[PDB]
Amino acid sequence: PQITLWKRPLVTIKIGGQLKEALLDTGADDTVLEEMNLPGRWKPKMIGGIGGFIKVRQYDQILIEICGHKAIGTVLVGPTPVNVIGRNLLTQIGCTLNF
Amino acid sequence: PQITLWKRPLVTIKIGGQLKEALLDTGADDTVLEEMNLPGRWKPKMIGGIGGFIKVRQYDQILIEICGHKAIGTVLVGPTPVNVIGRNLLTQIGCTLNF
Numbered sequence: 001p002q003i004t005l006w007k008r009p010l011v012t013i014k015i016g017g018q019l020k021e022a023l024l025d026t027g028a029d030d031t032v033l034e035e036m037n038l039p040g041r042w043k044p045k046m047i048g049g050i051g052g053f054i055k056v057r058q059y060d061q062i063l064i065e066i067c068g069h070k071a072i073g074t075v076l077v078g079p080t081p082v083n084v085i086g087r088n089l090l091t092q093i094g095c096t097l098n099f
Numbered sequence: 100p101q102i103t104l105w106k107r108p109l110v111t112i113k114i115g116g117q118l119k120e121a122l123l124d125t126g127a128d129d130t131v132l133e134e135m136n137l138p139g140r141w142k143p144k145m146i147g148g149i150g151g152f153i154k155v156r157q158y159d160q161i162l163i164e165i166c167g168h169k170a171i172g173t174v175l176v177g178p179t180p181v182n183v184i185g186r187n188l189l190t191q192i193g194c195t196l197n198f
C-alpha cells in the first residue's frame with residue numbers, strides 16, 4: 001500500500017502467533033517491541049534511543065508478519081514506549097520512502 | 100525521489116540559514132534538531148522515546164528546506180543525538196511509505 005503520514009503509520013503485525021499494533025519507523029535501525037513472551041533463546045543487548053540506552057532481549061531469526069508481508073529477522077524486546085518496526089524489517093517487506 | 104532503507108534515510112536540510120543532515124523519520128510525530136541558537140521566542144518542552152526524556156526548546160513557524168522541498172512548521176531544538184524530520188514536515192513535502 002501507499003501510506004500517507006498525517007497519522008502515525010500504525011499497522012497490525014503477527015509475532016509468536018499473536019497480533020499486535022506497531023509503528024513503521026524509518027528512523028529506527030532495529031525493531032523493538034514492548035515486553036512480551038516469545039519462544040526460544042535470546043541474548044542480552046543494549047540499544048540507544050533519544051533518551052539513552054535500555055536493556056533488551058534479542059531474538060534472532062524471528063518470523064514476523066507486517067501488514068500482510070512476511071519477514072524473518074531480529075526482534076528486540078524491552079521497555080520501549082512504542083512497538084516500532086525498524087529498517088531491518090522494513091527492507092524485507094520492500095518498504096521505501098517516496099516524495 | 101525514492102529512498103530505499105538499506106541505510107539510514109539521511110538528507111541535507113536547510114534551517115536558520117545553515118545546512119544540516121537529518122533523518123526522514125516516519126516514527127517521529129514532530130521534528131527534533133541538534134542544538135542551534137535560532138532567533139525568536141520559544142517554549143520549553145520534554146519529549147520522550149527509548150531511554151527516557153530530553154529537554155528541548157519549541158520554535159514555531161520555522162522554515163526548513165528538505166531535498167529542495169520547502170516546509171514550515173514546529174521544530175524542537177535540544178541535545179538530541181540525531182536530527183529527525185518528523186511527520187509534521189514530511190507531510191508537507193509529500194512523503195509516503197510504500198510497499
Ligand SMILES: CCOP(=O)(COc1ccc(C[C@H](NC(=O)O[C@H]2CO[C@H]3OCC[C@H]32)[C@H](O)CN(CC(C)C)S(=O)(=O)c2ccc([C@H](C)O)cc2)cc1)OCC
Pocket residue numbers: 023025026027028029030031032047048049050051052053082084086124126127128129130131146147148149150175180181183185
Ligand atoms: C549518536 C547516536 O546516538 P544513539 O545511538 C540514539 O540515536 C538515535 C535516537 C533516536 C532515533 C529516532 C527514533 N529511532 C529509535 O529510537 O531507534 C532505536 C531502535 O533502532 C535503533 O536505531 C536507531 C536507535 C535505535 C525513532 O525513529 C523516533 N522516536 C520515536 C519512536 C521511538 C516511537 S524518538 O527519537 O524517540 C522521537 C520522540 C518524540 C518526537 C517528537 C516530540 O514527536 C520525535 C522523535 C534515531 C537514532 O544513542 C543514544 C543513547
